[PDB]
């Protein structure tokens, strides 16, 4: 098996349009994910709140839905709770709160799209192993 | 005289690497066993037998490379290259695990040739063959672990694979499934190995700190001559020291060195006997009295019952990936887990 | 002389059947206290709450244990690294419930073993011999310090120190593997090469000397009587032993200097055990063995398992089952 | 002491290094080519990074027969092609 | 029954240590 | 004076020739990418 | 020259540095050359860390051990430990590195070109190991140098900007120390504290006032002791209880360095004051306590009553009592209830953790700090894979505390072996049987038999 464009095709927004990433964007988003997110989201789980993972089925049921590039990029700018009722920038890294999370200061708009694409491509490769925990290690 | 005595003369000539009649068996088998392992750990995979990568070519390092056992569907097949399984195909022979039997069988005969080499040289030199007798312990260990044990089981698959990390998996397998630490034959082996290492350290340290001053320099190594008649260290002072430090001490130098032979050899022979039992799943897994009491009394807890919980966790979490031919599908809800973890 | 000088002469006397010495002045009372408490506890001690969760573990013979399962149980996790002598408990019953005897035994033992090492130097000085036997003993001594003192310190509790029992030792080894992957640590591997190599060289040196014994006895009597205690002449032919082993491998791979040979017999297992003692001591600060979990992946990104991944599945099984009632949060950080 | 030429006199001679400064690098290059040309994969049947799974599969091609083992491996490889 | 057996064996070993040390064969230099 | 080809010559090269050949193969493997 | 051979010295090549015991000139070059190697590494390593330094990420995520030492002295950091000026880091590296060339030049000269013995050149610099007066004088000179060095830390804390204080209000800042603790009941009280849990001996010092006050005392004591040993000679009881030789003096200092090495290991493992967690990462206890608070905040936000929540064993799931009654975090972290940290102390009252402050006063920065320290626990593999031994590859992290603790325990242990080796030989050589037993005068042969 290879990393085909079909695997690198992820939804762009919640309307229906898609986008085909390059493998360079995939490897960039993976390196950026390990740089600013793996300390809590290694393997697609959440160490400080295991009830919420990075599985596509979980992101699709969030409010607003986060199972697309547009949803994830907006989350990395203005993160909210799973129901969209409270903004949690003071406790979650984001551009809006990059003053208290200094690692988010170096991220450009291109970087956010790469990080969002890696999160959507990875479950298509590892299946239940992404966000599944130690049972699937 | 005939060609036999002529060949005997050439085989026993004093050269840099002694050959002898035993060399006809030793050298090809030892070379093929060693070359088989280096070839497999460099180029050969375990993907079709185990679902594992195991060569440098696949990205493994020195700790993770291995020559893995054949698939469980092969049973106890000799896996000859010309046999009915490979049918003369060298490539298919590698992919089906034929290098494992190749290394184990040529290795088994290499050990025989080496022990015969110990006999052959001892006879020509004129010494007693106690070094050959001592080598029986590694042979019994090899035969019991790599041959007798899988022959008692379903197939070669459950023999130890030739690899660093693969041997480690073998160790953990015997804890969770056999409770091998609880076996008194392994305990006697542990005492023989650890006791052997103790004797080795304490004997060399005693000699090096009871030396006679036979030289003038600060380097005491030069003050020895391999043709001298006198002892190089004081047995009397060494006996006095240990009699006052430990209570007892050696007084006979011949008994001391035979004891250094006896302890490690007997230890390995004892653990070989235990492994033969485990070939038939004849384990020392449980204490019946502990289980009857713990079953009726939910407040009775010992380190014995705590270890069995660990063995049960090993079995359930390891078996699906370690025995892929069984198609073990364990749902998440059935896995034994403690709180939180 | 006065009373003090006569006492000093008796303490350092070389005529005592067992040497005392100044190190022995500390060693004798501390080892007797640890021994006497260990025997009483192993037989009659009530269960102790090792993990601090009100779940007492039975360790003594009178409470349903045999030789294999019996142990003196480590002190309670609620105590941690706090000093817990007898006079700090409200009663001996509280002291017994919380694992008090464990601290008394390990503390008196580690001190008496430390003075045992110093006692080895002292007699070597009184006898006019070289003094480095105690250096060889420092390797097993350092190992006992690691599992009884060093590892509890790094983890913050004597409840994670090695239990004083056969099955308890095995419990220590299994949990250690799940939480540190000690098998994949180079220092334990060097310790295995130290104990495997030591047993090999022990049988090797024993067989070669036994092989080259000079004929001094009859076939109807033990060959050991061919050596008399204190004789000046050596009892074996090292040149014949060198001639045999030199041909078993090659000439330059065999020893002809006995002092060089016996120093090697001392260096190999001692150094190997130093490393494995340092392994436990450094893994006490969570610098663990090699981690190659999911290190091999294919072109698409599928994980290609190795034997290291199979070891990790076994480690996971030990991890999720050990101390099944003591964890309330997802990460076992100590 | 035996009869062969000592190693110290060999590795320090000019004639030894005239030969082995060519044979040793040649054997090194030959091993390199064995991998870079991809021959090592075909000789031993070791999968390439893109030959472990089919594009849309997560099952291990495990051999389940003893006497049909050769035919199962060839069936597995044909699924990738 | 078991407890008495375990302790009895242990006590015999301790008594053997006493005789093996203080009532040993004295090493004599011929 | 001294012979060139001996049994020692054979035993040495049966180990040395594949070792260097193997070292070259493993060296090339460090530049393989997935 | 002199020796440089077995027959001329008695020692083999693998013990060749022992041929310098009586060659004071070349021995001086060895110590000065080795001193140059130490300053070289300090300068080179600092420049390496600076070149690989990224200010946007914490220091403990970058494998830095020397920059955290400079930041603790108050250089280059502002409020909260954030780096504001990397130039002081560059200056320290360059000055140490350039100074190594001067020490290297003198070490090579004194060991190769200089006179092999200083006793004929100048009677002041020349010395003999048996001269108990010259030895104590050289000891007194170096005691004074050590005394002034401890006062340099005091002058920095009081007159040249101060030190970084992790306990300062506002999340930490650089603070000048104006009132050092001079009370001997407090300074020497640390020496008499128990080394066990809840006490910690001198490792428990948790304020800069006690740190700088102690270095004032140590500075004066070293200078006073230096003057003492220059003007005096060892008394009778001291000259009968000690071996007076070069190897013996080395063995004494080997025991001392080994002792200091074990103490430093615990210091970097437990102390978060002189090893601020903002730079070195959280301690073992700190990260374990941070996990309990993380899920306390998590569950309480969901509506849970953390005070009355009974856990599976019967103990509280979040909060329980210590053996002496203090309200502490529940779970396995009960062992770490002696931990004190700036992010946790606002929640403590007279009886331990105050439930009212837990239900009302938890701030976002405290939830932030606890989540950061929980996910940076000092656990990692030898190949720098962060997390428990069963974690997958992803996070490239090993805490600097683990590196500093493990490395110095190894060094401390081997130096203890070095003490034993060199001290045992010093006894034997001074008595005259370090080379073996005299066949014509074996002591045991002149002793009565044991039985
Ligand atoms: C010390 C000195 C050391 C010197 C070194 C010497 C090295 C020589 C090495 C010899 C190689 C040994 C090959 C043995 C292979 C083996 O056995 O191969 C096994 C086969 C039997 O085949 C097995 O048979 C099993 C039982 O099957 C039977 O049952 C099945 C279910 O009912 C079906 O019905 C099946 O048709 C029926 O045959 C399964 O089929 C297995 O898959 C199949 O492998 O026997 C056979 O080849 C022959 C069996 C005859 C006995 C062989 C004697 C030696 C065996 C030693 C055993 C020691 C005891 C171990 C515990 C027992
Ligand atoms: C020769 C003459 C000397 C002989 C004297 C012998 C006297 C007895 C020796 C004591 C035995 C050591 C017990 C160590 C117990 C322990 O928990 O020691 C650790 C303590 C650290 O104590 C911890 O100190 C902590 C201090 O931190 C507190 O304060 C900090 C301030 O920032 C933080 O705020 C932190 O959160 C807060 O808790 C707490 O008090 C902890 O509860 C407490 O455990 O270190 C210490 O006191 C210092 C280090 C002790 C030495 C370490 C022993 C190593 C010996 C190895 C030898 C190997 C030999 C092999 C031979 C072969
Ligand atoms: C015959 C006798 C032979 C004896 C010789 C000695 C044994 C030979 C093998 C050891 C020599 C190392 C060779 C391979 C070195 C190498 O691949 O070394 C690899 C690394 C360089 O690799 C870098 O290693 C880094 C390690 O992570 C570090 O950097 C990361 C940056 O993101 C994180 O900050 C992480 O926390 C931090 O740990 C990252 O992995 C980088 O990606 C990677 O490039 O070298 C370094 O770091 C280490 C180099 C300096 C060594 C000093 C280490 C001393 C530490 C004290 C020892 C404590 C021991 C305790 C017991 C165990
Ligand atoms: C000391 C030498 C020696 C020994 C003991 C072995 C032993 C073995 N090898 Mg190995 N081998 C060797 C050298 C040796 N090898 C060398 C030098 C090579 C390189 C070419 C190989 C290459 C090799 C391969 C490639 C394979 C083996 C395999 C085997 C095993 C099966 C052997 C078998 O079935 O033969 C049967 C026994 C004989 C053929 C000997 C019969 C001789 C009789 C006594 C002659 C007289 C009777 C005879 C009928 C009359 C002769 C004429 C007649 C034939 C017409 C066995 C463990 C196989 C294996 O390990 O499978 C996993 C395998 O696949 N070997
Ligand atoms: C910290 C490491 C260290 C240091 C400083 C020394 C220093 C010394 N050793 Mg020792 N040694 C060491 C490690 C060290 N050794 C180790 C590890 C071993 C075991 C292999 C030995 C084995 C050993 C033996 C066997 C002997 C010494 C001797 C000596 C002396 C050298 C005598 C001489 O003329 O050398 C001459 C050497 C040379 C001409 C070679 C060139 C060396 C120069 C200094 C290299 C400088 C390089 C550097 C980049 C220059 C920068 C210049 C710049 C600053 C301007 C000297 C005092 C000898 C002695 O006792 O003398 C009486 C002696 O016999 N040593
Ligand atoms: C502690 C180490 C040490 C020791 C004990 C010695 C001792 C000696 N050296 Mg050596 N040397 C050293 C380090 C050392 N040196 C270093 C690091 C270098 C490299 C620069 C040299 C280079 C060197 C040479 C080139 C020569 C000597 C010579 C000598 C001898 C004569 C010294 C004399 O008369 O005093 C002279 C003392 C002074 C001139 C004092 C001035 C030096 C100070 C440190 C500078 C001023 C600093 C200032 C006061 C500090 C202000 C505060 C600041 C911290 C901010 C003597 C045996 C000579 C010799 O043996 O001839 C055969 C000789 O030719 N040495
Ligand atoms: C590291 C620096 C150093 C060194 C190596 C020495 C070395 C020496 N000093 Mg000096 N001293 C120093 C600094 C130093 N001093 C300082 C700074 C001062 C000023 C306070 C003094 C004041 C001083 C005096 C007043 C005297 C010495 C004397 C001596 C000599 C014998 C000391 C002795 O018996 O030690 C071994 C120590 C003892 C036997 C006493 C301690 C015994 C107890 C029971 C052991 C306790 C150990 C403890 C449990 C472990 C540490 C725990 C602790 C932290 C609580 C020796 C040459 C004596 C001498 O001969 O005069 C020249 C002497 O009378 N010194
Ligand atoms: C840290 C590395 C190891 C340091 C210690 C050296 C090995 C010592 C371990 C066993 C001690 C046993 C106690 C009885 C053994 C005993 O009594 O030994 C005695 C033996 C000879 O003693 P001599 O008195 O003849 O010489 C020692 C000194 O007196 C110097 O002349 O000592 C040695 O051979 C010293 C080894 C030099 C070590 C330098 C080389 C290190 C090589 C090993 C490290 C290799 C890399 C790893
Ligand atoms: C199987 C087989 C065979 C055989 C083959 C062979 C015989 C091979 C060989 C092979 C070989 C023969 C190989 C080799 C290789 C080698 C190597 C690969 C090596 C490496 C090494 C190294 C890596 C080293 C390292 C080190 C050490 C270890 C220690 C010290 C240091 C050093 C670093 C040096 C035949 C043909 C019959 C056919 C059938 C099958
Ligand atoms: C005696 C002896 C020895 C020893 C020696 C020694 C130890 C030496 C030392 C040496 C040294 C210790 C040296 C040092 C040097 C240094 C230098 C040479 C420096 C320089 C520097 C520089 C030039 C810098 C520059 C820079 C800057 C300024 C800025 C930034 C950039 C850079 C970095 C570029 C031996 C063993 C070998 C041998 C035997 C004898
Ligand atoms: C800075 C600081 C501080 C302070 C500290 C101090 C003040 C210290 C001191 C220290 C000291 C004050 C120490 C001492 C030590 C001592 C010793 C370590 C001793 C030793 C001794 C010996 C070793 C002896 C021995 C012997 C004997 C027993 C018998 C006879 C013989 C002889 C003499 C050998 C504090 C914490 C506040 C805070 C932080 C900072
Ligand atoms: O205690 Mn005894 O074992 Ca060291 O981790 Mn945590 O805590 Mn417990 O779990 Mn796993
Ligand atoms: Cl457990
Ligand atoms: Cl917990
Ligand atoms: Fe011997």
Short mmCIF file of C-alpha atoms and ligand atoms in Angstrom, two decimals, chain B residues 23-26 28-29 32 78-82 93 98-103 105-106 109, ligand 4:
data_model
loop_
_atom_site.label_atom_id
_atom_site.label_comp_id
_atom_site.label_asym_id
_atom_site.label_seq_id
_atom_site.Cartn_x
_atom_site.Cartn_y
_atom_site.Cartn_z
CA UNK B 23 36.40 -30.59 12.39
CA UNK B 24 34.74 -32.40 9.48
CA UNK B 25 31.45 -32.08 11.39
CA UNK B 26 32.12 -28.94 13.44
CA UNK B 28 30.67 -26.70 8.19
CA UNK B 29 27.83 -26.91 10.73
CA UNK B 32 26.28 -22.60 8.29
CA UNK B 78 11.87 -30.57 9.05
CA UNK B 79 11.33 -27.87 6.38
CA UNK B 80 14.01 -29.28 4.11
CA UNK B 81 14.75 -27.08 1.10
CA UNK B 82 13.95 -30.04 -1.17
CA UNK B 93 11.80 -21.60 1.71
CA UNK B 98 13.03 -22.59 6.59
CA UNK B 99 16.05 -20.75 7.97
CA UNK B 100 14.94 -21.44 11.54
CA UNK B 101 15.14 -25.22 11.15
CA UNK B 102 18.29 -24.74 9.06
CA UNK B 103 19.97 -22.90 11.95
CA UNK B 105 19.53 -28.43 12.94
CA UNK B 106 22.98 -27.37 11.72
CA UNK B 109 25.21 -30.89 15.02
C1 LIG H 4 29.15 -32.04 8.21
C2 LIG H 4 28.39 -31.69 7.17
C3 LIG H 4 26.98 -31.42 7.20
C4 LIG H 4 25.97 -31.98 7.95
C5 LIG H 4 25.99 -33.03 8.97
C6 LIG H 4 24.70 -31.34 7.51
C7 LIG H 4 23.44 -31.68 8.01
C8 LIG H 4 22.24 -31.20 7.54
N1 LIG H 4 22.01 -30.29 6.55
MG1 LIG H 4 23.55 -29.36 5.51
N2 LIG H 4 25.01 -28.57 4.26
C9 LIG H 4 26.36 -28.80 4.40
C10 LIG H 4 26.98 -29.66 5.36
C11 LIG H 4 26.34 -30.42 6.29
N3 LIG H 4 24.95 -30.41 6.55
C12 LIG H 4 27.10 -28.03 3.41
C13 LIG H 4 28.56 -28.04 3.27
C14 LIG H 4 26.16 -27.32 2.67
C15 LIG H 4 26.43 -26.39 1.56
C16 LIG H 4 26.16 -26.99 0.20
C17 LIG H 4 24.84 -27.66 3.21
C18 LIG H 4 23.61 -27.16 2.74
C19 LIG H 4 22.37 -27.52 3.22
C20 LIG H 4 21.03 -27.07 2.78
C21 LIG H 4 20.78 -26.09 1.71
C22 LIG H 4 20.11 -27.76 3.56
C23 LIG H 4 20.90 -28.61 4.46
C24 LIG H 4 20.09 -29.38 5.35
C25 LIG H 4 20.63 -30.22 6.29
C26 LIG H 4 19.85 -31.18 7.19
C27 LIG H 4 19.24 -32.31 6.38
C28 LIG H 4 20.28 -33.24 5.80
C29 LIG H 4 19.64 -34.31 4.97
O1 LIG H 4 18.44 -34.56 4.81
O2 LIG H 4 20.55 -35.10 4.32
C30 LIG H 4 20.23 -36.50 4.26
C31 LIG H 4 21.50 -37.23 4.49
C32 LIG H 4 22.36 -37.48 3.50
C33 LIG H 4 22.11 -37.05 2.11
C34 LIG H 4 23.63 -38.22 3.76
C35 LIG H 4 23.65 -39.58 3.10
C36 LIG H 4 25.07 -40.11 3.00
C37 LIG H 4 25.11 -41.63 3.03
C38 LIG H 4 25.69 -42.13 4.34
C39 LIG H 4 25.92 -42.17 1.86
C40 LIG H 4 25.81 -43.67 1.74
C41 LIG H 4 24.37 -44.11 1.53
C42 LIG H 4 23.84 -43.62 0.19
C43 LIG H 4 22.38 -44.01 0.02
C44 LIG H 4 24.67 -44.15 -0.97
C45 LIG H 4 25.20 -43.02 -1.83
C46 LIG H 4 24.80 -43.18 -3.28
C47 LIG H 4 23.29 -43.00 -3.46
C48 LIG H 4 22.86 -41.62 -3.01
C49 LIG H 4 22.90 -43.24 -4.90
C50 LIG H 4 20.93 -31.68 8.18
C51 LIG H 4 20.74 -31.14 9.57
C52 LIG H 4 18.66 -29.01 5.04
C53 LIG H 4 18.04 -28.36 6.25
O3 LIG H 4 18.63 -27.87 7.22
O4 LIG H 4 16.68 -28.32 6.24
C54 LIG H 4 16.05 -27.42 7.15
C55 LIG H 4 18.71 -28.00 3.86
O5 LIG H 4 17.70 -27.53 3.33
N4 LIG H 4 22.21 -28.47 4.26
#
